[PDB]
Design a protein around this ligand. Structure first.
Ligand SMILES: *[C@@H]1O[C@H](CO)[C@@H](O[C@@H]2O[C@H](CO)[C@@H](O)[C@H](O)[C@H]2NC(C)=O)[C@H](O)[C@H]1NC(C)=O
Ligand SMILES: *[C@@H]1O[C@H](CO)[C@@H](O[C@@H]2O[C@H](CO)[C@@H](O)[C@H](O)[C@H]2NC(C)=O)[C@H](O)[C@H]1NC(C)=O
Ligand SMILES: *[C@@H]1O[C@H](CO)[C@@H](O[C@@H]2O[C@H](CO)[C@@H](O)[C@H](O)[C@H]2NC(C)=O)[C@H](O)[C@H]1NC(C)=O
Ligand SMILES: *[C@@H]1O[C@H](CO)[C@@H](O[C@@H]2O[C@H](CO)[C@@H](O)[C@H](O)[C@H]2NC(C)=O)[C@H](O)[C@H]1NC(C)=O
Ligand code: NAG
Ligand code: NAG
Ligand code: NAG
Ligand code: NAG
Ligand code: NAG
Ligand code: NAG
Ligand code: NAG
Ligand code: NAG
Lengths: 600, 600
């Protein structure tokens, strides 16, 4: 009755308790979906016929500050794994430390950047030390959840498309592998995932560690598995991320891949007897600052719908039933009715009201106190890992005639700055789009620049993503010293509430939900007609970034967990560009709750 | 600030705190809908723009046995009124004692029939005494809820189409009115409702009591209110039951009235400035034995959908929005989004299994013990106010050749009997349909007859509705003595579970519902493909009668309140005619849970 799971090289498969085995898995990120709904998605996953999941452990989700760890409630990954086990699902764990995943900085904590020249995903001694410490914290929590110790964990990913990274460090991989073996034991099954081309496996694979690839419908399947077999002559064929859809970018049209094309490809993969994981099965949500970025800079939106088999709000889609039908070819699917798409409710129009700009509330926003520096400091340099940062200086010259805010020594404003002087908004600045802007003000006037972190790049080489001013800020090639920066405690500020482009300002509105209705509150979608861009919280929960005027995302997912009946619902919007709220028309100064999402 | 509500004869209206007032009400029966959902319907009623409700107090719902009263939880009418008041809705109370309402025996308790020749709705001293006692119990509970005492009760109905009853007793009405004035005070506003023809008001109205009529879309509105004015020259015009739809009968096709026809008529009524109540606004449910009957006998089904503006399960229908739109012509409608149609879930097919016939379980069904009588006793005579009754005797003659079960002295088998001998089902008997049946058995064989109460007549003269055998049971005009009757405690029996027509037998099946799903359990509809007729309980809650083979009702409403997650769901079906469960096909021996009702 002992649980003996191990790769069967002879018969190119897995063996579970002596029986041939191959897994049909789907990715689910417990962190892009609220814990309130975890069971739901996982049960749907079981009802789809998957027998395993493939999930990432984002290091930054559990250690926002060095040595500070969060693992309870919404932070309780171990409970998530235990719940999956209770549902009869196996688990493929992917603990990184880099996960990509269109997630902030690939999971790595921003405070790593406190060493300016430090190198991530390399043999950098400080990087390796921090990685080791994180592993020494995380992995003992996973140890009792390993299959051979009676839990659902059957295989473990060590990296993610490591062949795409510039370093090509095999000492780094060896160091990771030694530490994983040390903390987790020799029994664990360790694997890699890389792009389906031998060039990437060249720098990704490693001895004493199984090698796998990923690929979607636009790859020769034969060629892909031939590429894998060139690195793993014996053992199961595995596609760890067979893409069912694709990520989005703001402005870029929403990617859509036909359902039945994915279905046909999936059938083809299954017919070879391989192991496939559907990335993503549910996409979930890009919370406040969890989004990543590519290069050339292009942040991912709030919605992570992904065109996944389960929609952002968990709806059963035609894709879901198609994939269930395909999977039922190769395994009996669980009996019983499938949990439904959640109910949606249109709460309708809710009004807001100008509360205060960031500048006029920094003390409430930053009650510990501000930061002073000779030259500007970056987001990391000011010890604010997310959010927005206020840069303040004095004008050294009279600017009665519009003077040009222009280049800095090496084009290092990232990623967006809203510029103003003594509460007079001057316009916008951004990377690759707008770096020059005429401004006006008297000599000695207070210049305030609000810098937004639009997301740390999550893929490629450009992980040294400073965020804000690093270099000597210059106006018309004229230097600027004596800077005061302001980190903003937006989360506690929203949770407490002190208890013609419009300057970044807060608009607070309320709405009530009746008590005693069994099927209220329900999940919903928030729309911002007439707004431009900002951040939104409900009852202190940061739902993420909105940008309807840029699109393609319009609605934001609102999980019903955050609404409280009888007690007033208190929405706070931080608008960065424009609000319909100056004139005498109040109806325009409203957001809306809708039932059917509109994201593309 | 004193609350002064009274009829304004001068200006043909009501006055509320000195202001002209007319009400736009809808009927809601707190008892045909589970308390779990009361708020829901009432809030929808508020969102429809109604400012009052018109509801019945069924005497039999609160006093099933003489001197035994139930008023807590699901029995807490006073809490229902208080909840309505809390929602800002006024209340029109209609406490009967007869309510018609397609409800059992017009609300009157069946034990009144323990006096065989007693007369209901007359000056019968025992009837008047029982009525008085009921009023003396009920009305002091309503007193603090009266408008002038700070509650939502503004007017009170004393009868219901009294002009349709044969007695034409004005002493009876005077007695009621005196008792109502005595217990409730002179301040109360008292009114009547009758069919819209002077002939009925002739016997319905009464001095010192306001007179109103009811009528639907097939009545001359001018003529109807002229008829009212002939009895009330001054005061508001009132239609207390403007029918938006109609009741159903088993077998009779489901009545449907076009939405917009009702809308046009409603607008016409409103334009006269009258007071109108929409009967029904929600219909709700016909539980276990709460249905009524007409003459010639025709029981109402389980569904009381009524084609009401709110569907049986509370869905917003095109009729609802149409009526809201009409009402918004004459009054501002409440602000905010309207509570939605409830979510529905298809739990799918659930199997059952033959447990035991009634005969083989009477001890468990009747643990106090059976009844013995020289000649058969009626349902009332055996002190079982609902349910089914077992009649047992011995065959006095050899019946090797089929002998005719035939007439009794005055055709008094009501309403349906399933006949068998020692567990050999012989067929069916019913009133006006089948009273003759050939049977076979040896002399001295035990003859068991299972008699179903299909519903006590709720309208007309025929309230002396015995239910079962009253007269000397005869086979081929041959008398039968030495009877043993068996009252069945079906409710406690289901709640405990001891912890080719098929004989009436119990089939128990289970189904499980996953835990941790925020939007599960949901309301549902149960279907019985292949079954014929019987009673169904879930977790001991008697959902009512099913009869798909007769129709028009197929599905049964299942409110989500009765489902319990993790704990097994235990459905019990008492089938009276036929089950698909003898052969080796188990799939046929299943009921189904569906999401969309199919009732017509
Ligand atoms: C910002 O300007 C200061 C001006 O002093 C720079 O500081 C000097 O930079 C030169 C190179 O440009 C070095 O050789 C000196 O050693 C620096 N001196 C000090 C005291 O730091 C600074 O490097 C500039 N930084 C940026 C990012 O432009
Ligand atoms: C949303 O705003 C309402 C309005 O103040 C809050 O309701 C009060 O919250 C305070 C907490 O600071 C309590 O002390 C009061 O008792 C609450 N009012 C009542 C009538 O009880 C509500 O708490 C706010 N919600 C959130 C999530 O902050
Ligand atoms: C059932 O049969 C019995 C037979 O005795 C009837 O009892 C007699 O009925 C006659 C009228 O038919 C009366 O005059 C007698 O006074 C009754 N005698 C007794 C002792 O009751 C009885 O009435 C019959 N009942 C029915 C409903 O048919
Ligand atoms: C439905 O049937 C199940 C199966 O027995 C019941 O579950 C048990 O109920 C008994 C009560 O007699 C408890 O003592 C047991 O502890 C229950 N089982 C477990 C595992 O806890 C369930 O109670 C039944 N439901 C209803 C409403 O009768
Ligand atoms: C893939 O490539 C192999 C050889 O390179 C070829 O035989 C096969 O037909 C190709 N299939 C597809 C779908 O491109
Ligand atoms: C910017 O600086 C240059 C110095 O060469 C000066 O000539 C120019 O006038 C400045 N710009 C403005 C708008 O004054
Ligand atoms: C900047 O700060 C230094 C610190 O002493 C001060 O000497 C200098 O005058 C300041 N310059 C301006 C422009 O405020
Ligand atoms: C919500 O805020 C508005 C702002 O005027 C206020 O009128 C309203 O009463 C508030 N809602 C509740 C339930 O108090
Ligand atoms: C109703 O009857 C009155 C007089 O009896 C008549 O004037 C009116 O036109 C009738 N209206 C309808 C709708 O029958
Ligand atoms: C019924 O009773 C009559 C008595 O007149 C008898 O003649 C007849 O045979 C009986 N019926 C049967 C089926 O025996
Ligand atoms: C009916 O009961 C009486 C009561 O004593 C008994 O005398 C009689 O024999 C019984 N008759 C039958 C047919 O059982
Ligand atoms: C429900 O009853 C069936 C009858 O065989 C049984 O197999 C099943 O285990 C029961 N369900 C649960 C959850 O125990």
């Amino acid at each position: 009755t002992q649980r003996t799971f191990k790769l069967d090289y002879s018969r190119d498969r897995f063996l579970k308790d002596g029986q041939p085995f191959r897994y049909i898995s789907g990715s689910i990120h417990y962190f892009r979906i609220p814990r309130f709904y975890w069971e739901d998605r996982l049960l749907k996953m079981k009802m789809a016929g998957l027998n395993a999941i493939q999930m990432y452990v984002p290091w930054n989700f559990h250690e926002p500050q060095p040595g500070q760890y969060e693992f309870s409630g919404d932070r309780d990954v171990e409970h998530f794994i235990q719940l999956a086990h209770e549902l009869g699902l196996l688990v493929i764990l992917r603990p990184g430390p880099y996960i990509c995943a269109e997630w902030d900085m690939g999971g790595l904590p921003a405070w790593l950047l406190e060493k300016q020249s430090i190198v991530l995903r390399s043999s950098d001694p400080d990087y390796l030390v921090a990685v080791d410490k994180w592993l020494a914290v995380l992995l003992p929590k996973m140890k009792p959840l390993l299959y051979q110790n009676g839990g659902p964990i059957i295989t473990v990913q060590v990296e993610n498309e490591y062949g795409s990274y510039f370093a090509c460090d095999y000492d780094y991989l060896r160091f990771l592998v030694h530490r994983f073996r040390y903390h987790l034991g020799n029994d664990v099954i360790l694997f890699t995932t890389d792009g389906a081309s031998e060039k990437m496996l060249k720098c990704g694979t490693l001895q004493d560690l199984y090698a796998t690839v990923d690929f979607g419908t636009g790859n020769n399947i034969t060629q892909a598995f031939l590429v894998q077999r060139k690195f793993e002559p014996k053992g199961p064929l595995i596609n760890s991320e067979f893409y069912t859809g694709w990520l989005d970018h703001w402005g870029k049209p929403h990617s859509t891949v036909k359902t039945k094309t994915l279905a046909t490809s999936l059938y083809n993969l299954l017919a070879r007897g391989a192991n496939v994981n559907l990335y993503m099965f549910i996409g979930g949500t890009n919370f406040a600052y969890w989004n990543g970025a590519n290069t050339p800079y292009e942040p991912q939106p709030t919605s992570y719908d992904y065109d996944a088999p389960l929609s952002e709000a968990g709806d059963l889609t035609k894709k879901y039933f198609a994939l269930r039908e395909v999977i039922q070819m190769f395994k009996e699917v669980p009996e019983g009715p499938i949990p439904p798409s959640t109910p949606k409710f249109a709460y309708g129009k809710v009004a807001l009201r100008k509360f205060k700009t960031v500048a006029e509330a920094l003390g409430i926003l930053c009650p510990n106190g501000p930061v002073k520096s000779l030259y500007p400091l970056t987001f990391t340099q000011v010890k604010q890992y997310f959010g927005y940062v206020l840069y303040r200086t004095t004008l050294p010259q009279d600017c009665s005639n519009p003077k040009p805010i222009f280049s800095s020594p090496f084009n290092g404003v990232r990623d967006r700055a809203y510029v103003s002087v003594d509460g007079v908004p001057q316009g916008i600045l951004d990377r690759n789009l707008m770096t020059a802007l005429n401004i006006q003000g008297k000599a000695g006037a207070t210049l305030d620049i609000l810098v937004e972190n639009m997301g740390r790049v999550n893929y490629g080489r450009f992980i040294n993503d400073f965020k804000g001013l690093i270099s000597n800020m210059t106006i018309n090639s004229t230097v600027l010293t004596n800077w005061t920066v302001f980190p903003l405690d937006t989360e506690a500020m929203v949770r407490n509430h002190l208890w013609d482009l419009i300057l970044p300002t807060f608009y607070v509105g309320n709405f009530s939900i009746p008590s005693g209705i069994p099927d209220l509150p329900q999940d919903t979608f928030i729309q911002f007609p007439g707004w431009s861009k900002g951040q939104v919280w409900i009852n202190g929960f940061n739902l993420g970034r909105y940008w309807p005027t840029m699109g393609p995302q319009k609605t934001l997912f609102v999980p019903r967990n955050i609404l409280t009946t009888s007690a007033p619902n208190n929405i706070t919007v931080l608008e960065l560009e424009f609000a319909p709220c100056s004139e005498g028309t109040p109806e325009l100064c409203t957001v809306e709750f809708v039932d059917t999402p509109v994201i593309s």
